Amino acid sequence: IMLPWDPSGKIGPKKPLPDHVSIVEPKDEILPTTPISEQKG
Amino acid sequence: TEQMTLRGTLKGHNGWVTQIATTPQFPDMILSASRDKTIIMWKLTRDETNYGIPQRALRGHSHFVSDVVISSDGQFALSGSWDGTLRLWDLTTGTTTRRFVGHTKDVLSVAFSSDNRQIVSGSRDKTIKLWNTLGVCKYTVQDESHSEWVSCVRFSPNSSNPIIVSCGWDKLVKVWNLANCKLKTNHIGHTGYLNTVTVSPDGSLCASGGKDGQAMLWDLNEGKHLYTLDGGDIINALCFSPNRYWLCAATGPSIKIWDLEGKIIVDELKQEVISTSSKAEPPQCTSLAWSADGQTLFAGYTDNLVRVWQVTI
Amino acid sequence: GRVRTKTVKKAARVIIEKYYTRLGNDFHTNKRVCEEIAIIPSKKLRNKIAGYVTHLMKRIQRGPVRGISIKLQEEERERRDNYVPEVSALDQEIIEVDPDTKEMLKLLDFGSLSNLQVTQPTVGMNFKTPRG
Amino acid sequence: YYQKYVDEASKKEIKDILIQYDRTLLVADPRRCESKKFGGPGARARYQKSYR
RNA sequence: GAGACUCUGGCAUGCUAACUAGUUACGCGACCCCGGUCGGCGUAACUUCUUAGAGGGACAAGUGGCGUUCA
Ligand SMILES: [Mg+2]
């Protein structure tokens, strides 16, 4: 019987499956157009 | 009314030159790393027979040599490696006196005080460690830190202004006050990651290069950006000459020394014999450092080769 | 033989396709990128990912790939299509026309046209492809 | 000794004369003695199939 | 399923460290011609060696042809 993965680690490993690559979608990144300042501190 | 020229070359590497470190006290002495684990300690004869001869070899790094730096005094040099740590090499006997262990991640920057007394070391873990010469981490910031990464930090040669600039892979040229020890200014506007930052001999303007392949000038008379001259190809290293009002810049295959009086490129000096002109990479320039007077420039390249570029006139 | 698995390859295409800019050609640097941005449990997995991610970045830096829709390519297509020459090729000062289209237009309403030329008949009957 | 406590040109000249004579001096012999394995009378053989 | 994984080998003069591990500095003693030798004796720190936990470490990294210059 193949047991399910669980971060709890009671029944199995903390580790994700070594094959299973849960790949997340990249965040919306803004390229800064002008050099500018907000000088403080 | 002057032009650079290849005075000589230091042929002594198997892998390519990750970083080369210079010192103003001894002009005929350069300490150069490679992809292999060594750091070759050259002796620059500059004679008819050979330009340089390997004097010592600072063997110690477990794996590939990332960064190496020499102090302004020149008898010692601290190097950093993928072990995480750095090693204070005694450059005469060519061996470590004191090893700086402490950094959690790759040490991408290290900086002496103007006194060459205090040491500060920056790594990709959101920390800035600060030490004395006796070698104790007096304080580091871990919880109170950046959301992103701090790839490099450097010092201002001017002693009266205790200021350090820091580039990174977040594309932000940060500026910190050593007195306040909190950032003076961030500078959003830069697309692409920054490689190197350097300050001018006068201490008025300072160049900055990065992924853009652009020499973005910040002002030291007033902490303000002024204007940018395009290095073009990835700027792997930059360095100001002390005697001249020059900006040396590693721009891809060749070196570029711009003038600030008239904002215009003068010339790019590429060797004609380029071998990889057939579905091959050309030799991209990775590092540079001016000599004490600024008449010789040591430049380390991706073709496992350190060319020196003397000013003729 | 050092060949990439589908878990290796798909990961490299996802890495270059999502963060082409962060990535580069050299393994050991863009490795630092891959370990930071992506949490790879094994060092072997990390390093393999990085080495195929590097060589692939050089492939794209060399040129455009066939079976993938890059957003940059979408922008250049919008740019190229908006490329317009000075004049259209269709605008012509004189248009050649055959005698059948002359006869057919003359029977139709559109008899006289200013810029037409009922050209000569194609003499020399050799149009069929040889047999055998 | 010459690379460490004196100048390195001696290390390269010695090392190069060595490279120009013979590469085994530098390329290590990784070779080591292989163990006999269960399932046979010898080292590689798996057990003797015996007709008859 | 292969691969992946786990363990082992290896790069770590780096982190953490040890009179049930030793160490480097010397000196003595018998003899041989000042020293050399000795599991004969003494001077402390440390972990280079030793032992083993945590981390870290190399990846087709370089090039040529060939190939959608892709794999
Ligand atoms: Mg398998």
Q: Which nucleotide is nearest to B86 (CA to C1')?
A: E14
Q: Is A28 exposed, middle or buried (0-12, 13-18, 19+ CB in 10 A)?
A: exposed
Q: Locate tokens 């020394």: which residue?
A: B257
How far is C83 from C66, CA to CA, in rounded Å?
23
Contacts of B208 (CB under 8 A, 6+ apart): B165, B167, B173, B194, B196, B197, B198, B215, B216, B217, B218, B238
How far is C22 from B169, CA to CA, in rounded Å?
9
User: What is the CB neighbour count within 10 angstroms for residue B228?
Assistant: 17
User: What is the CB neighbour count within 10 angstroms for residue D20?
Assistant: 8
Q: Locate tokens 């094959």: which residue?
A: A19
Cβ-Cβ contacts under 8 Å, B188 against chain A = 32, 35-36
- Cross-strand bridge partners of residue B107: B123
The three-class DSSP label of residue B40 is strand
Phi, psi of B301 (to 5 degrees): -120, 170
Contact predicate C20/C57, CB 8 Å: yes
Span CA (B141) to C1' (E27), Å: 51
Contacts of D27 (CB under 8 A, 6+ apart): none
Q: Pick the closest to residue B92 from B71, B74, B110 (CA basis).
A: B74
Contacts of B301 (CB under 8 A, 6+ apart): B16, B17, B283, B284, B285, B286, B307
> Cα of D30 to ligand 1 centre, how many Å?
25
Q: Of how many residues is chain A composed?
A: 41
Q: B106 to chain C, minimum CA–CA distance in Å?
A: 9
Name the helix (H) or strand (E) containing B56. strand B52-57
Residue of D nearest to B53 (CA): D9
Span CA (D30) to C1' (E55), Å: 28
Resolution of the entry in angstroms? 4.1
Residue of C nearest to B106 (CA): C32
Q: Pick the closest to residue C34 from C68, C1, C57 (CA basis).
A: C57
Cβ-Cβ contacts under 8 Å, B171 against chain A = 32
Phi, psi of C7 (to 5 degrees): -70, -30
Protein residue minimizing CA–C1' distance to E13: B60
- Cross-strand bridge partners of residue B257: B248
- Mark residue B84 as left, alpha or beta (left: phi above 0; alpha: psi -120 to 50; beta: remaining): left
Cβ-Cβ contacts under 8 Å, A33 against chain B = 189, 191
> Cα of B21 to ligand 1 centre, how many Å?
46
Read off the amino acid at residue D42.
Answer: G
Q: Which nucleotide is nearest to C9 (CA to C1')?
A: E71
Span CA (B172) to C1' (E41), Å: 68
Q: CA-CA-CA-CA torsion for C49, C50, C53, C55, nearest 10 degrees?
A: -120
Q: Locate tokens 């060399």: which residue?
A: C62
- Alpha carbon separation from C81 to B97, C71, C76, C77, C88 (Å, rounded): 66, 15, 8, 6, 14
Q: Please state how this structure was obtained.
A: cryo-EM
How far is C17 from C105, CA to CA, in rounded Å?
57
- Alpha carbon separation from B42 to B31, B52, C8 (Å, rounded): 6, 6, 42
Contact predicate B208/B215, CB 8 Å: yes
How far is B51 from C128, CA to CA, in rounded Å?
77
Q: Which chains touch D (3 or more CB pairs under 8 A)?
A: B
Protein residue minimizing CA–C1' distance to E9: D30
Q: C21 to chain B, minimum CA–CA distance in Å?
A: 8
What percentage of chain C's residues is helix, strand, coil (to nearest 5)? 50, 5, 45
